[PDB]
Design a protein around this ligand. Structure first.
Ligand SMILES: [Ca+2]
Ligand SMILES: [Ca+2]
Ligand SMILES: [Cl-]
Ligand code: NA
Lengths: 252, 252
C-alpha cells in the first residue's frame, strides 16, 4: 500500500520510480504533480507515502494533518528532492505542518543546488554502511555521481546516512592533466522517526535532471514499464538502492 | 532558418534547445520525435538542421536524399547524441545515406555509453580551444561533466575538438579519502565539411538524461520558454557553448 505523488506524470519523470516499483512487483497509487490531494480514503489506506516534485500547495491543510497523524501512527514517509520538493522553487514544504515530522530542517529561501562539476554520494560515517538502506552496495568501489540537490539540514535526533561531496576539478591543456580538488559537502540522505513511523529525506532526485549518474548505477540494466508510463532502462544498483530505501521506510 | 527534429516534444526534452534558441532570438521550425519528415517545403528552406533523438525511421529515403543534397550545397547539419541518435537503440543512422555526410563513423550495434561516475569534457588537443566553437569558455578552469554519449569515431578528414574522459573514483571509508583514477576516453565533438556545408557530431545529449552537469555549466543562469514548451533554467556556459556550436555549423 504505497502512494507516490509528483515527478510531473507517468509519461515523464514519474515513469522512473513507477517502473522500479513495477519491477519489484509493488502495488501503488500515483498522483501527478498537477493533481491535488485532499483528506479521505485514498490517503487513509497507505503504509508508505512518497512525495517527490509535488508542491506543498497540492495538499489541503487537512490532508497534511491526516498525513502527519498517520506517520505518527506508523505510516512511512519519504521525500525525494527536486525543484518542487523541500523549499525549492514552488515546493514550499517548510511552510507546512509536515515539516515537523520530516527529519530535516527546510530552508525558507531557494535551496536548489545544481552541480556542473562532479559530485559523489559517499557514506556519512564508517558505520553508515551497516544501515539496511546502505547495505550490499559498492559505496567504496563505485561511488555514484549526482546532478543536484536541495540544501537541507539533519535535525538533532535524525541520522545522516549519505553525504554529497562536491568536486571542482581543473584541467591543464599544457600538461594534459586533471587536478581534483574538493569544495563543499551536503547532506544527501537523512532518516528518522516520528511517533512509530519512519521518515526519510533524500536531498537529490530519483529522476532527471538531478538524479545524474546514479540512475545508471551498476554494471547491469533493469528494464520495466509501469502502466501508463514510458519504458525505462536503468542501473541495477539504482533499483536496489531505492528499493532498500523504501523498504526501510515502509518497514518491509 | 533552422529545423530542429527530435527530443520527444517541446513540453519535454526539446524544451531545452528550443528555449536556448528562443533566448538567442532565433526563429526555428520543430518536428517531434513521433512525427515523420518527407521531401517538402519544410525541409527545403533551411540553413541549419539539428537532429537529436530523431530516429532514422522518421525520415523518408527521399527526405534523406534532399537533406544530403542541401548540406553539400551549403546547409549546416548537427547531430546531437542520445538513445535515438547515431545507432543508439532505435536510432539506426548508420543505415542511411546521411551517414555519408556526417564527420564520424557510426556503429552497427548498440553504441550507448551511460556514465554512473564522473566523466569530463576536455579539449582534444592544445589548439582545439582556438576553434570558434570552443572559444571563450573555461575548459581549463571548469571542465564540465556529462552523463553519457554514443560511441562514435572521427572520420579521417574531420577534426575532433572535444574528448570525454571517463573517471573511476573509489572512496575509502577508513581513510576518509577519494582516489581519482581515469579510464577510457571517447570522442565528444567532431566537425567537418560535406561539399560546402559544415557538419558537427556531438556525442552527448543537449537534454536529459545524458546532458548531465553540462546543462548547468557556469556560475549564472539563463531562463527562457519557447512557445509550446516548458520554462527552462540552465547554465550560461551551456547556452554559450551550444550557441557557438550551432552558429559555426550554420555559418552565422
Ligand atoms: Ca523529480
Ligand atoms: Ca536527447
Ligand atoms: Cl500521469
Ligand atoms: Na580510519
Amino acid at each position: 500500500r504505497v502512494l507516490y505523488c509528483g515527478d510531473t506524470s507517468l509519461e515523464t519523470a514519474a515513469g522512473y520510480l513507477a517502473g522500479l516499483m513495477t519491477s519489484w512487483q509493488w502495488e501503488f497509487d500515483y498522483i501527478p504533480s498537477h493533481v491535488g490531494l485532499d483528506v479521505g480514503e485514498l490517503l487513509a489506506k497507505q503504509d508508505l507515502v512518497i512525495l517527490s516534485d509535488y508542491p506543498a500547495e497540492r495538499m489541503t491543510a487537512q490532508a497534511i494533518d491526516q498525513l502527519v497523524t498517520m506517520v505518527k501512527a506508523g505510516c512511512g514517509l519519504v521525500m525525494l528532492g527536486g525543484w518542487e520538493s523541500y523549499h525549492g522553487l514552488g515546493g514550499n514544504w517548510d511552510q507546512t505542518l509536515l515539516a515537523e515530522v520530516l527529519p530535516v530542517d527546510i530552508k525558507s529561501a531557494d535551496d536548489r543546488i545544481n552541480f556542473d562539476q562532479p559530485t559523489l554520494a559517499i557514506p556519512a560515517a564508517i558505520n553508515s554502511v551497516s544501515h539496511p538502506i546502505l547495505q550490499n552496495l559498492p559505496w567504496e568501489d563505485r561511488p555514484p555521481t549526482i546532478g543536484g540537490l536541495n540544501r537541507i539540514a539533519a535535525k538533532a535526533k535524525a541520522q545522516t546516512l549519505l553525504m554529497a561531496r562536491v568536486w571542482r576539478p581543473t584541467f591543464s591543456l599544457e600538461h594534459g592533466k586533471t587536478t581534483w580538488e574538493h569544495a563543499d559537502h551536503h547532506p544527501l540522505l537523512v532518516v528518522g522517526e516520528a511517533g512509530t513511523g519512519r521518515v526519510a529525506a533524500f536531498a537529490s532526485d530519483v529522476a532527471p535532471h538531478w538524479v545524474g549518474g546514479l540512475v545508471d548505477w551498476g554494471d547491469e540494466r533493469v528494464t520495466s514499464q509501469a502502466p501508463g508510463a514510458g519504458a525505462i532502462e536503468v542501473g541495477n544498483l539504482y533499483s536496489q538502492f531505492f528499493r532498500q530505501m523504501l523498504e526501510w521506510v515502509a518497514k518491509s
